Design a protein around this nucleic acid. Structure first.
Lengths: 351, 255, 254, 255
DNA sequence: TAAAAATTTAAATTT
DNA sequence: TTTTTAAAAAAAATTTAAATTTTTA
DNA sequence: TTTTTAAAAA
């Protein structure tokens, strides 16, 4: 994640953020950051502090969340692929350790919230104690396997494989909440996957091509810009934030002009500030080749999905039955062709 | 430096009510020979081709080929600020950040200036070639609103069949099985009820329905819908504005 | 091969817009001399009794006593496609469970065929006629819709008192205490706006009001309400459709 | 025993529909020679000053200066149970906690008896006098309702410029700069349409728009609005009911 | 001119 | 004074049941 | 993973 990238794009480029509707696409194949959806349905789905458990004492809130979200977005015509998180790299382990210490501090304050008897502090501090596990990864992968909706196991984090999926043209968008796919090279990034209410969080796109056209920068210039903003691999310069970085990239080139221009007393460079492979994995990540695997939005298996989703996870039959009949309604074929196949673009207009 | 004065004002209100719910980021290609809006849906499904020429404006005067791009929800609210009989005078300057709309009252007691600001906006232009369409049907517009609304009640897709005897709007879904045959008029010679089914070949195309509802929100602009299509080309839902031009709608068929 | 040429299709449209929210699944007991519907509601506290006889259709044809399960919200959304002057011709098949409805225009320009997906559900008869109804109130339906809509703002339970000089609608609650004494107005030469009453025994009994609001949505069907009630016997809200049949509405009082 | 038989019951219906969305708990300060209300239920100064004199009623008989507390949306619902041509009678027995509302239909068929369950509440009025209103405009209520209804789409701030030539309802916000000007039309034979301005010094006062929208939702009582304001005195939105009294609203300017 | 009817919001449950 | 860092605030979705606009004539 | 935002800071 990049601190303040979306605020910087909303300050600079309003033409690259397109607040669209949920139902507007109807056949635009998107790619989901799956673990972001697992956490977004693990914090948010609870009984006021009590997570959705089972008879076996294991949670099921992220399964119902992906169920309700994926049926509500396939009912609007969006065909997703859920790209899952794999192995985070060794350069990412510093901010991973900072998130681990944030979880340790939250688990420390959870004991004082339990001893103090505050009913709202204990909910807000069991919010931060979440963990994507391999049990959770296999459980979500098994649910999406019985969906008939494909999942791609990345060899790295899921943002880079989503960006490679959009860059190969196998999907048309990367439906991903954090802005790491813009610096991983995806031209299309939609955020805020709230298919329930349109007025709450509308779908806003992030055209990277429009960002690289109005700024005039190329891809690696935007990568070095997101470095001086600061990301989850490499730390930012102390004293350089969002407003300085547009000035320090926009009339400029790269890291080397910064380190031959900026004096190390006003804006000092941090010690052990690695960028040599942080730039390289951002341009060239360890991803899956999308021409190898084929996206198969197959028909769902019915009865074993009903019995696994209901009798093993304590669910009503009619809600899961309504979800699978809505998926079988939503998968009828009849792929909606776009207008760019028929009419050729003869330019644009300025203002 | 652009100034267009309309001697009837409700037509631009009907255009903005047509163009509110469909598209929001549209750039007005204003030339000296007319006012054009070539714009497209954000998900690349539907296209809007508005053409308002110089013969219907009472005082049209635009020097250079200046292009402005508004928020069509905001301009739809500004056109909702005018009444149905207000004389609308458009007003703009050279590279101006604000678009001025002067809604003059017809009985001259409410001259409401409206400086709506612009935004930095680009829309790509897709050139439609002049082509002969096979199923060119001209048919009533409130009837088209009835067909599109009452088949969007049923399902999400309308499979239009064109033949010699009449046009057939068929929609299928979980709700039932709609099948509306709309035959050719042989007795009524009035243009506002004539349903002409003139052909070159029979076609069978499947379109969407939310976009057809957004298309048939242009109902009060015209009585006749010159619904032009062929076997591969997207259909032309054309609303002939009275002596100003046409609001042309384009929608790609499902395959 | 059921076929029912109905000229005034707004009658059937107002039936299915009068039964869409009260009834979600119903059965159409199509006899050879009319069509019936004696379905229960969703909460199983009211009963909707509908009868359109075959003397009001233009042409009518039946071969069996076929009964079909029709989702009334589905058939209401299909009957929204017809116009207020469009004729409606129902069609049914023996082998296929489709209810085909073609909607011809008054002119010969627009034919709107509309099939259906019929559900499968059980049939049962709970009419029980000749219940010895003590009093009738034949009041206008717009007036009765005004009574139900005005009394619905106060509470959820209404008591209805009947007397010789008029009928008394009254409710209670936290929001107020209303009491409408709708009077004897048989002196009006318009019988259609007149209120006529006959009395054998004074009654006062607590009906529900939410399902009465569900009942009074048949006010575009007929512009009279033939409500008849008793002491412990459930009432009717009878909508006498003009030369076609009648639609009743039973509610056991609380 | 308070008695007020009002034959034009749509006046009280429109008063309660006006004060439904504005005031929730209002005291009905009933006098021996009129019916008065002075209350506010907003975080902003939203004083509503209602006069219903005894001369325009069909029968008035009150022998006490009683003032009852009314949950005003419930009385608004009960007044919405009335008809537009309905004779409305107000009764209030001394020892009862009920405001008895009796509706007599003009065909003498539907006779109602609603009892409004009162509650004990006391609020302190402020008492704005007629403190030399420098700029008063008399103008149609549909025009003012239209101006406030479409200027609320732009933003929240309406500045009201006035001079001898006309009144200017300028407004700006997040969307544009809407500048509705008017003209004093004393030559119109229609007196409800004839905009008349009596001005001493020009004024320009910023006002809120949601409270003024709630103020201008008292439209169909009167055809005209006696809108008056001064340099620092709060705004008066006056609806002079036809031989019944006035419904005066008070809006503090936003400095 | 009003009320069906499409639409939006908030609240308890979704376990 | 704009800005950068810092310490906080937070991550849905369905049915159910009023509420607020649009259209119908 | 996100946004604010109110103190600090060059």
């Amino acid at each position: 994640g990049i601190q303040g990238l979306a605020k910087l794009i909303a300050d600079v480029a309003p033409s690259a953020i397109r607040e669209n509707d949920i139902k507007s696409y109807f056949g635009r194949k998107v790619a989901i950051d799956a673990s972001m959806s697992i956490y977004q349905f693990l914090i948010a789905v609870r009984q006021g502090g009590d997570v959705l458990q089972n008879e076996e004492g294991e949670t099921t809130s992220h399964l119902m969340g992906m169920f309700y979200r994926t049926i509500r977005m396939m009912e609007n015509g969006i065909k997703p692929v859920y790209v899952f998180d794999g192995k985070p790299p060794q350069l990412k382990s510093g901010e991973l350790a900072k998130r681990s210490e944030r979880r340790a501090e939250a688990e420390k304050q959870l004991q004082q919230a339990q001893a103090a008897g505050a009913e709202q502090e204990v909910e807000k501090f069991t919010k931060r104690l979440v963990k994507v596990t391999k049990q959770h990864n296999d459980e979500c992968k098994h649910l999406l396997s019985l969906m008939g909706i494909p999942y791609l196991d990345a060899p790295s984090e899921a943002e880079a494989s989503c960006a490679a999926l959009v860059k190969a043209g196998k999907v048309y968008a990367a439906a991903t909440e954090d802005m790491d796919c813009l610096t991983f090279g995806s031209p299309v990034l939609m955020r805020h996957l709230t298919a329930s209410e349109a007025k709450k969080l509308p779908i806003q796109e992030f055209h990277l091509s429009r960002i690289l056209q109005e700024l005039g920068l190329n891809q690696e210039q935007f990568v070095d810009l997101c470095i001086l903003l600061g990301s989850d691999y490499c730390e930012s310069i102390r004293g350089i934030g969002p407003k300085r970085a547009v000035d320090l990239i926009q009339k400029h080139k790269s890291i080397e002009e910064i380190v031959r221009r900026l004096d190390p007393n006003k804006y000092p460079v941090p010690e052990n500030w690695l960028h040599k492979e942080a730039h390289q994995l951002f341009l060239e990540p360890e991803v899956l080749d999308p021409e190898s695997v084929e996206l198969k939005w197959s028909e769902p298996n019915e009865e074993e999905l009903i019995k696994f989703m209901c009798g093993e996870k304590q669910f009503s039959e009619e809600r899961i039955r309504s979800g699978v009949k809505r998926l079988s309604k939503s998968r009828q074929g009849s792929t909606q062709g776009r207008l760019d196949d028929f009419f050729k673009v003869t330019g644009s207009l300025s203002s | 430096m652009f100034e267009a004065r309309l001697v009837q004002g409700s037509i631009l209100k009907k255009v903005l009510e047509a163009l509110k719910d469909l598209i929001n980021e549209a750039c007005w290609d204003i030339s000296s020979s007319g006012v054009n809006l070539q714009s497209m849906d954000s998900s690349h499904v539907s296209l809007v081709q508005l053409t308002l020429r110089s013969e219907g404006f009472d005082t049209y005067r635009c020097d250079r080929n200046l292009a402005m791009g508004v928020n069509l929800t905001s301009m739809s609210k500004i056109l909702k600020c005018a009444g149905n009989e207000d004389i609308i005078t458009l007003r703009a300057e050279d590279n101006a950040d604000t678009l001025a709309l002067v809604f003059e009252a017809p009985n001259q007691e409410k001259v409401s200036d409206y400086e709506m600001k612009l935004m930095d906006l680009d829309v790509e232009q897709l050139g439609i070639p002049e082509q002969e369409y096979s199923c060119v049907v001209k048919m009533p517009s409130g009837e088209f609103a009835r067909i599109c609304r009452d088949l969007s009640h049923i399902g999400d897709a309308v499979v239009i069949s064109c033949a010699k005897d009449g046009v057939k709007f068929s929609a299928s879904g979980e709700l039932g099985n709609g099948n509306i045959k709309l035959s050719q008029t042989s007795n009524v010679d009035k243009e506002e009820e004539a349903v002409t089914i003139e052909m070159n070949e029979p076609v069978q195309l499947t379109f969407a329905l939310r976009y057809l509802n957004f298309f048939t929100k242009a109902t009060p602009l015209s009585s006749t819908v010159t619904l032009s299509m062929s076997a591969d080309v997207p259909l032309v839902v054309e609303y002939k504005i009275a002596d100003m031009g046409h609001l042309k709608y384009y929608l790609a068929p499902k395959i």
